[PDB]
């Protein structure tokens with residue numbers, strides 16, 4: 001399968017992440033794409049192409065225009081405000097707060113943010129557009145008739161909502177891909193999120209959209225980021241009722257339990273009538289991933305890919321989470337190998 | 342007037358504060374109480390006394406018990422979780438999020454927090470309880486017949502809402518004092534927040550209570566912390582409709598303009614029929630304050646104190662903001678001087 005990848009992902013290289021009460025090197029670092037690209041390549045997927053340039057038309061159908069405008073100039077305004085560190089939100093619109101949007105950069109960053117563990121830095125906006133472009137190019141391949149394609153997106157996007165960034169995400173690549181397929185002729189598209197963390201961002205974008213189905217398997221929000229979304233009870237709202245399916249699971253979950261959730265999610269996706277599935281692939285469910293508590297092994301990733309591919313509909317894999325361990329590449333390569341059959 | 346003060350305020354000595362994308366020494370540090378206490382004694386207010394022992398009965402009538410329970414063991418759990426730095430929230434329940442409460446320490450801290458700039462540290466809970474004791478003791482002085490008294494609270498409390506901490510606040514001292522006065526036999530009490538920042542926590546606590554009136558003068562939330570509450574349109578709700586009065590003002594506001602808002606706010610308080618007024622005094626409105634944009638001069642605090650005492654009802658002054666310059670003590674003392682007459 002073709003691999004879409006942009007070298008400009010490296011433009012995203014913030015030096016700080018708020019974690020455990022300290023500012024440390026980001027977990028979502030550039031080396032991630034390097035090892036993944038290397039592993040999938042030696043796995044046989046070496047047909048790598050750079051993404052083409054794309055306007056904001058597609059992304060403007062899933063993200064708030066004010067949010068996008070904010071991101072594009074955030075760093076400039078933050079630096080111009082006299083701040084020494086990187087752009088990190090401190091005040092947030094939580095319970096019982098006014099819905100008004102602030103004017104100052106310090107207020108707007110909080111308004112447009114769901115998590116302070118993600119800082120905006122020079123290049124974030126340009127890197128984010130390159131990652132979005134990889135997703136759009138992968139979608140076009142599927143629309144062109146390709147059975148499978150892999151967009152090595154970075155930074156990831158599943159935690160980015162309609163009008164908020166966080167979880168190392170700014171532009172929801174999987175959401176753009178999905179919208180792009182609809183724009184190309186599809187009437188129903190599904191997004192399957194196997195990243196360890198819930199795709200709060202993606203859920204938000206399609207919560208009231210009936211033409212898109214969202215299924216996510218993730219660590220139980222009651223005890224894993226993002227914490228405030230991902231509960232089984234959330235199934236959609238209004239025009240999008242019944243199009244959201246969450247499968248929260250607890251610590252130590254083995255593939256034997258995870259796989260069952262996967263099987264059920266694919267059953268709901270089949271019933272929905274998805275013409276294609278955008279897969280938000282996160283290999284952070286690995287038993288050896290530092291910030292996660294699932295116990296899947298490398299071989300399970302081959303099963304995962306094979307199973308999703310058995311849906312019989314075209315597949316677009318979009319890269320998301322997966323950290324630390326040098327096996328992130330192997331695990332991503334295994335999913336693709338599983339899809340190839 | 343008598344001065345209620347506690348040495349256990351020192352137990353709150355956080356080492357980090359997320360400001361400008363960096364972890365720097367907290368603006369709200371112990372030296373603040375030292376400078377203020379010395380200045381009030383200097384001005385003749387040397388009758389300082391330590392607060393008596395008080396239970397949680399009063400505070401339980403204004404704060405959520407789940408929230409209070411959370412604060413008492415937040416630092417312990419945080420450390421047991423293996424985190425190096427101090428307890429700082431990263432994930433927050435923002436727009437379109439679930440109302441569910443997480444079970445993990447990392448999730449609960451975000452759930453019970455409105456601003457990431459405030460960190461929980463060893464001794465914060467005990468420090469917060471002493472500051473609340475001083476407020477209660479001050480309240481009883483007013484209930485006993487005193488025309489005025491000063492509760493030198495630290496940490497501050499006006500940013501602490503019903504079930505959330507932030508803005509250097511954990512327990513709403515002014516709210517507890519107001520509640521205490523009502524428990525002593527009062528039917529209608531008012532809180533006047535002159536601190537530079539909006540009293541978002543105080544507003545939240547009494548938003549739906551008709552027995553308490555809340556008036557606040559503060560930097561326009563569109564460009565001043567907390568950024569998500571403090572607009573003139575917020576006048577109350579349900580059982581407490583019409584009991585909230587916000588006066589947001591722009592950058593560089595001098596006493597010439599600020600004075601008019603004070604006058605109107607006192608007029609509404611009188612029309613409400615307040616039997617006593619708790620005054621949340623923050624001197625961060627000073628032209629030299631490092632994090633505020635108002636332009637009050639030190640003499641203006643004398644005029645302010647006098648104008649408020651001219652209300653003709655008992656006054657309980659509760660310390661809040663005021664940072665950087667040592668003049669904070671002079672400004673606070675000038676208010677007590679204006680009030681004393």
Ligand SMILES: CC(=O)NCCCCNCCCN
Pocket residue numbers: 019117156157158159167168169195197225282291320321322447
């Ligand atoms: C795209 C993505 O997978 N992002 C991960 C979200 C960051 C989780 N925050 C770290 C806190 C752990 N204690």
Ligand SMILES: CC(=O)NCCCCNCCCN
Pocket residue numbers: 106360361458497498499500508509510536538566623625632661662663
């Ligand atoms: C009780 C009180 O006075 N709290 C003040 C809270 C300060 C907000 N953080 C500073 C934001 C400017 N960058």
Ligand SMILES: [K+]
Pocket residue numbers: 193194195196197198199216217218
């Ligand atoms: K997921």
Ligand SMILES: [K+]
Pocket residue numbers: 534535536537538539540557558559
């Ligand atoms: K105020």
Ligand code: NA
Pocket residue numbers: 206207208209210211212213214236240243244
């Ligand atoms: Na939907």
Ligand code: NA
Pocket residue numbers: 547548549550551552553554555577581584585
């Ligand atoms: Na009220």
Ligand SMILES: [Zn+2]
Pocket residue numbers: 195196197282284320321322
């Ligand atoms: Zn993840």
Ligand SMILES: [Zn+2]
Pocket residue numbers: 536537538623625661662663
């Ligand atoms: Zn203040």
